[PDB]
Protein backbone atom coordinates (compact mmCIF):
# COMPACT_ATOMS: atom_id res chain seq x y z
CA UNK A 1 0.00 0.00 0.00
CA UNK A 2 3.01 2.36 0.43
CA UNK A 3 5.76 3.53 -1.91
CA UNK A 4 9.17 1.90 -1.25
CA UNK A 5 11.06 4.71 -2.97
CA UNK A 6 10.41 7.82 -5.09
CA UNK A 7 10.80 7.68 -8.87
CA UNK A 8 13.83 9.75 -9.92
CA UNK A 9 13.30 10.36 -13.67
CA UNK A 10 11.21 12.90 -15.59
CA UNK A 11 7.41 12.67 -15.11
CA UNK A 12 6.02 11.48 -18.51
CA UNK A 13 3.20 14.04 -18.65
CA UNK A 14 1.53 12.79 -21.82
CA UNK A 15 1.29 9.26 -20.32
CA UNK A 16 -0.52 10.33 -17.10
CA UNK A 17 -4.08 9.14 -16.58
CA UNK A 18 -4.68 10.13 -12.94
CA UNK A 19 -3.13 10.36 -9.45
CA UNK A 20 -3.83 9.72 -5.79
CA UNK A 21 -1.89 10.15 -2.56
CA UNK A 22 -0.92 7.35 -0.17
CA UNK A 23 -1.67 7.25 3.58
CA UNK A 24 0.18 9.27 6.21
CA UNK A 25 1.31 5.96 7.81
CA UNK A 26 3.77 5.55 4.87
CA UNK A 27 7.47 6.37 5.35
CA UNK A 28 7.96 7.52 1.76
CA UNK A 29 4.49 9.13 1.68
CA UNK A 30 3.81 9.89 -1.95
CA UNK A 31 1.81 11.28 -4.79
CA UNK A 32 1.32 8.23 -7.04
CA UNK A 33 0.68 8.94 -10.75
CA UNK A 34 -1.18 6.24 -12.71
CA UNK A 35 -0.26 6.07 -16.40
CA UNK A 36 -2.65 5.21 -19.23
CA UNK A 37 -0.75 1.89 -19.46
CA UNK A 38 -1.65 1.38 -15.77
CA UNK A 39 1.87 1.84 -14.33
CA UNK A 40 2.32 3.63 -10.97
CA UNK A 41 4.91 6.39 -10.54
CA UNK A 42 5.81 7.11 -6.89
CA UNK A 43 6.56 10.81 -6.43
CA UNK A 44 7.63 13.32 -3.78
CA UNK A 45 4.53 15.41 -2.91
CA UNK A 46 6.73 18.44 -2.14
CA UNK A 47 8.60 18.39 -5.47
CA UNK A 48 7.65 21.32 -7.73
CA UNK A 49 7.36 19.27 -10.96
CA UNK A 50 5.18 16.75 -9.12
CA UNK A 51 2.89 19.56 -7.87
CA UNK A 52 2.65 21.04 -11.38
CA UNK A 53 1.63 17.67 -12.87
CA UNK A 54 -1.05 17.18 -10.22
CA UNK A 55 -2.39 20.70 -10.88
CA UNK A 56 -2.70 19.82 -14.58
CA UNK A 57 -4.46 16.50 -13.83
CA UNK A 58 -6.79 18.20 -11.35
CA UNK A 59 -7.86 20.64 -14.11
CA UNK A 60 -8.89 17.66 -16.26
CA UNK A 61 -10.86 16.05 -13.40
CA UNK A 62 -12.57 19.21 -11.98
Amino acid at each position, epitope marked *: ECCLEYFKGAIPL*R*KLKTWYQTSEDCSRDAIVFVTVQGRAICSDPNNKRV*KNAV*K*YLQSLER
Partner: antibody
Amino acid sequence: EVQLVQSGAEVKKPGESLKISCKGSGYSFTSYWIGWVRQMPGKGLEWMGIIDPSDSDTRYSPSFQGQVTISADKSISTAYLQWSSLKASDTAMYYCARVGPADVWDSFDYWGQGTLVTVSS
Amino acid sequence: DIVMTQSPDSLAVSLGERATINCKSSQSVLLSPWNSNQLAWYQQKPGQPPKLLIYGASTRESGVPDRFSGSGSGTDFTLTISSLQAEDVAVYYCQQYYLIPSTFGQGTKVEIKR
Protein backbone atom coordinates in the same frame (compact mmCIF):
# COMPACT_ATOMS: atom_id res chain seq x y z
CA GLU B 1 14.16 19.03 -43.29
CA VAL B 2 11.03 17.47 -41.73
CA GLN B 3 8.79 15.76 -44.29
CA LEU B 4 5.56 13.81 -43.88
CA VAL B 5 4.66 11.96 -47.07
CA GLN B 6 1.15 10.60 -47.43
CA SER B 7 -0.01 7.97 -49.89
CA GLY B 8 -1.94 8.85 -53.06
CA ALA B 9 -5.61 9.64 -53.64
CA GLU B 10 -7.92 6.64 -53.19
CA VAL B 11 -11.20 5.88 -54.96
CA LYS B 12 -13.07 3.09 -53.20
CA LYS B 13 -16.47 1.38 -53.04
CA PRO B 14 -18.60 1.16 -49.87
CA GLY B 15 -17.66 -1.90 -47.79
CA GLU B 16 -14.06 -2.06 -49.03
CA SER B 17 -11.17 -1.87 -46.56
CA LEU B 18 -8.43 0.75 -46.78
CA LYS B 19 -5.13 1.55 -45.12
CA ILE B 20 -3.46 4.84 -45.86
CA SER B 21 0.05 5.75 -44.79
CA CYS B 22 2.09 8.71 -43.52
CA LYS B 23 5.88 8.39 -43.88
CA GLY B 24 8.24 10.56 -41.90
CA SER B 25 11.72 11.68 -42.87
CA GLY B 26 14.32 14.25 -41.85
CA TYR B 27 13.76 13.83 -38.07
CA SER B 28 13.60 11.23 -35.25
CA PHE B 29 10.26 9.54 -36.02
CA THR B 30 9.86 7.91 -32.59
CA SER B 31 10.52 11.26 -30.85
CA TYR B 32 7.16 12.81 -31.84
CA TRP B 33 3.54 11.86 -31.83
CA ILE B 34 1.58 11.76 -35.12
CA GLY B 35 -2.04 12.86 -35.48
CA TRP B 36 -4.76 12.25 -38.03
CA VAL B 37 -7.17 15.02 -39.00
CA ARG B 38 -10.32 14.63 -41.15
CA GLN B 39 -11.63 17.35 -43.47
CA MET B 40 -14.90 16.49 -45.16
CA PRO B 41 -15.59 18.37 -48.44
CA GLY B 42 -16.17 22.09 -47.77
CA LYS B 43 -15.98 21.53 -43.98
CA GLY B 44 -13.53 22.17 -41.11
CA LEU B 45 -10.73 20.23 -39.45
CA GLU B 46 -11.59 17.32 -37.11
CA TRP B 47 -9.01 15.87 -34.73
CA MET B 48 -9.34 12.08 -35.06
CA GLY B 49 -6.57 10.59 -32.89
CA ILE B 50 -2.84 10.56 -32.17
CA ILE B 51 -0.20 7.86 -31.74
CA ASP B 52 3.19 7.74 -30.05
CA PRO B 53 5.32 5.69 -32.52
CA SER B 54 7.83 4.86 -29.75
CA ASP B 55 5.33 2.53 -28.00
CA SER B 56 2.10 2.62 -30.13
CA ASP B 57 0.22 4.40 -27.32
CA THR B 58 -2.88 5.46 -29.29
CA ARG B 59 -5.55 8.04 -28.33
CA TYR B 60 -8.86 8.49 -30.23
CA SER B 61 -11.51 11.14 -30.24
CA PRO B 62 -14.71 9.62 -28.79
CA SER B 63 -16.30 10.32 -32.23
CA PHE B 64 -13.79 8.06 -34.03
CA GLN B 65 -12.90 5.41 -31.42
CA GLY B 66 -13.84 1.96 -32.73
CA GLN B 67 -14.54 3.50 -36.16
CA VAL B 68 -10.96 3.63 -37.52
CA THR B 69 -7.66 2.17 -36.38
CA ILE B 70 -4.54 4.27 -36.10
CA SER B 71 -1.20 2.42 -35.97
CA ALA B 72 2.50 2.94 -36.60
CA ASP B 73 5.50 0.84 -37.61
CA LYS B 74 8.61 2.43 -36.18
CA SER B 75 10.99 0.15 -38.12
CA ILE B 76 9.94 1.96 -41.32
CA SER B 77 9.04 5.38 -39.82
CA THR B 78 5.39 5.08 -40.98
CA ALA B 79 2.03 5.86 -39.34
CA TYR B 80 -1.25 4.45 -40.67
CA LEU B 81 -4.98 5.10 -40.66
CA GLN B 82 -7.27 2.24 -41.59
CA TRP B 83 -10.88 1.22 -42.04
CA SER B 84 -12.17 -2.32 -42.29
CA SER B 85 -15.35 -1.27 -44.16
CA LEU B 86 -15.67 2.14 -45.85
CA LYS B 87 -18.88 4.19 -46.01
CA ALA B 88 -19.70 6.89 -48.56
CA SER B 89 -19.71 9.29 -45.58
CA ASP B 90 -15.93 8.59 -45.12
CA THR B 91 -15.31 10.69 -48.26
CA ALA B 92 -12.86 13.33 -47.04
CA MET B 93 -9.32 14.63 -47.09
CA TYR B 94 -7.19 12.96 -44.40
CA TYR B 95 -4.14 14.73 -43.09
CA CYS B 96 -1.43 13.34 -40.90
CA ALA B 97 0.51 15.85 -38.86
CA ARG B 98 3.32 15.89 -36.32
CA VAL B 99 2.57 16.99 -32.75
CA GLY B 100 5.21 19.43 -31.49
CA PRO B 101 7.44 18.59 -28.52
CA ALA B 102 6.12 21.11 -25.92
CA ASP B 103 4.42 20.28 -22.56
CA VAL B 104 1.86 19.06 -21.82
CA TRP B 105 0.55 18.76 -25.40
CA ASP B 106 1.39 20.89 -28.44
CA SER B 107 0.19 22.23 -31.80
CA PHE B 108 0.67 20.38 -35.08
CA ASP B 109 3.97 21.76 -36.30
CA TYR B 110 4.30 19.90 -39.65
CA TRP B 111 1.55 18.49 -41.91
CA GLY B 112 1.45 15.86 -44.63
CA GLN B 113 0.05 16.90 -48.02
CA GLY B 114 -3.17 14.95 -47.33
CA THR B 115 -4.75 11.85 -48.83
CA LEU B 116 -8.05 12.34 -50.63
CA VAL B 117 -10.43 9.41 -50.05
CA THR B 118 -13.53 9.10 -52.25
CA VAL B 119 -16.04 6.40 -51.39
CA SER B 120 -18.77 5.71 -53.93
CA SER B 121 -20.60 2.74 -55.49
CA ASP C 1 -13.73 18.13 -23.84
CA ILE C 2 -13.12 21.77 -24.76
CA VAL C 3 -15.25 23.28 -27.55
CA MET C 4 -13.64 25.94 -29.77
CA THR C 5 -15.79 28.59 -31.46
CA GLN C 6 -14.74 31.29 -33.94
CA SER C 7 -16.42 34.56 -34.91
CA PRO C 8 -17.26 35.76 -37.53
CA ASP C 9 -17.72 32.70 -39.76
CA SER C 10 -16.75 34.82 -42.76
CA LEU C 11 -14.91 38.11 -43.06
CA ALA C 12 -14.42 40.45 -46.00
CA VAL C 13 -11.69 43.06 -45.70
CA SER C 14 -10.31 45.58 -48.19
CA LEU C 15 -6.79 45.04 -49.42
CA GLY C 16 -4.48 46.84 -47.01
CA GLU C 17 -6.96 46.91 -44.10
CA ARG C 18 -6.89 45.29 -40.62
CA ALA C 19 -8.55 41.88 -40.23
CA THR C 20 -9.57 40.55 -36.80
CA ILE C 21 -10.78 36.99 -36.02
CA ASN C 22 -11.98 35.87 -32.57
CA CYS C 23 -11.79 32.45 -30.91
CA LYS C 24 -13.44 31.30 -27.69
CA SER C 25 -12.76 28.16 -25.69
CA SER C 26 -15.54 26.65 -23.52
CA GLN C 27 -12.99 26.32 -20.68
CA SER C 28 -9.68 28.07 -19.93
CA VAL C 29 -6.65 26.83 -21.95
CA LEU C 30 -4.14 28.61 -19.70
CA LEU C 31 -1.62 26.05 -18.54
CA SER C 32 -0.80 27.94 -15.36
CA PRO C 33 2.46 26.32 -14.08
CA TRP C 34 3.88 26.90 -17.59
CA ASN C 35 2.27 30.32 -18.00
CA SER C 36 1.31 29.48 -21.57
CA ASN C 37 -2.11 29.60 -23.27
CA GLN C 38 -2.34 26.34 -25.20
CA LEU C 39 -3.80 27.87 -28.34
CA ALA C 40 -2.72 27.73 -31.99
CA TRP C 41 -3.81 29.42 -35.20
CA TYR C 42 -3.54 27.77 -38.59
CA GLN C 43 -3.96 29.11 -42.11
CA GLN C 44 -5.31 26.91 -44.89
CA LYS C 45 -5.27 28.05 -48.53
CA PRO C 46 -7.46 26.27 -51.13
CA GLY C 47 -6.06 22.88 -52.12
CA GLN C 48 -3.31 23.05 -49.49
CA PRO C 49 -2.68 21.52 -46.04
CA PRO C 50 -3.13 23.80 -43.00
CA LYS C 51 0.01 25.69 -41.90
CA LEU C 52 0.85 26.63 -38.30
CA LEU C 53 0.94 30.45 -37.92
CA ILE C 54 0.84 31.14 -34.17
CA TYR C 55 1.29 28.92 -31.09
CA GLY C 56 1.14 29.62 -27.34
CA ALA C 57 -1.61 32.13 -28.26
CA SER C 58 0.93 34.82 -29.28
CA THR C 59 4.14 33.27 -30.61
CA ARG C 60 4.61 33.55 -34.39
CA GLU C 61 6.00 30.40 -36.04
CA SER C 62 9.35 30.78 -37.84
CA GLY C 63 8.95 32.40 -41.27
CA VAL C 64 5.47 33.80 -40.58
CA PRO C 65 5.20 37.50 -41.62
CA ASP C 66 4.96 40.22 -38.92
CA ARG C 67 1.47 41.34 -39.97
CA PHE C 68 0.08 38.21 -38.22
CA SER C 69 -0.31 38.47 -34.45
CA GLY C 70 -2.22 36.57 -31.77
CA SER C 71 -3.47 37.89 -28.45
CA GLY C 72 -5.77 37.02 -25.55
CA SER C 73 -5.77 34.72 -22.54
CA GLY C 74 -7.89 32.12 -20.76
CA THR C 75 -10.97 31.68 -22.95
CA ASP C 76 -10.90 34.61 -25.43
CA PHE C 77 -8.35 34.92 -28.26
CA THR C 78 -7.87 37.06 -31.33
CA LEU C 79 -5.97 36.70 -34.57
CA THR C 80 -5.05 40.04 -36.13
CA ILE C 81 -3.69 40.63 -39.61
CA SER C 82 -2.50 44.23 -39.41
CA SER C 83 -2.81 44.89 -43.15
CA LEU C 84 -4.44 42.31 -45.41
CA GLN C 85 -2.33 41.25 -48.39
CA ALA C 86 -3.72 39.44 -51.44
CA GLU C 87 -1.95 36.20 -50.47
CA ASP C 88 -3.71 36.22 -47.05
CA VAL C 89 -7.05 35.07 -48.48
CA ALA C 90 -7.55 31.73 -46.70
CA VAL C 91 -9.51 29.93 -44.00
CA TYR C 92 -8.15 30.48 -40.50
CA TYR C 93 -8.59 27.86 -37.74
CA CYS C 94 -7.96 28.13 -34.02
CA GLN C 95 -7.13 24.99 -32.00
CA GLN C 96 -6.75 24.21 -28.29
CA TYR C 97 -4.05 21.74 -27.28
CA TYR C 98 -4.50 22.14 -23.52
CA LEU C 99 -5.80 18.58 -23.52
CA ILE C 100 -6.57 15.80 -25.98
CA PRO C 101 -8.76 15.71 -28.16
CA SER C 102 -6.99 18.90 -29.25
CA THR C 103 -10.04 20.28 -31.02
CA PHE C 104 -10.25 22.94 -33.75
CA GLY C 105 -12.60 25.94 -34.13
CA GLN C 106 -14.96 25.72 -37.12
CA GLY C 107 -12.79 28.06 -39.26
CA THR C 108 -13.16 31.63 -40.53
CA LYS C 109 -12.98 32.39 -44.24
CA VAL C 110 -11.14 35.60 -45.09
CA GLU C 111 -11.81 37.21 -48.48
CA ILE C 112 -11.31 40.61 -50.18
CA LYS C 113 -14.00 43.26 -49.74
CA ARG C 114 -14.90 45.28 -52.87
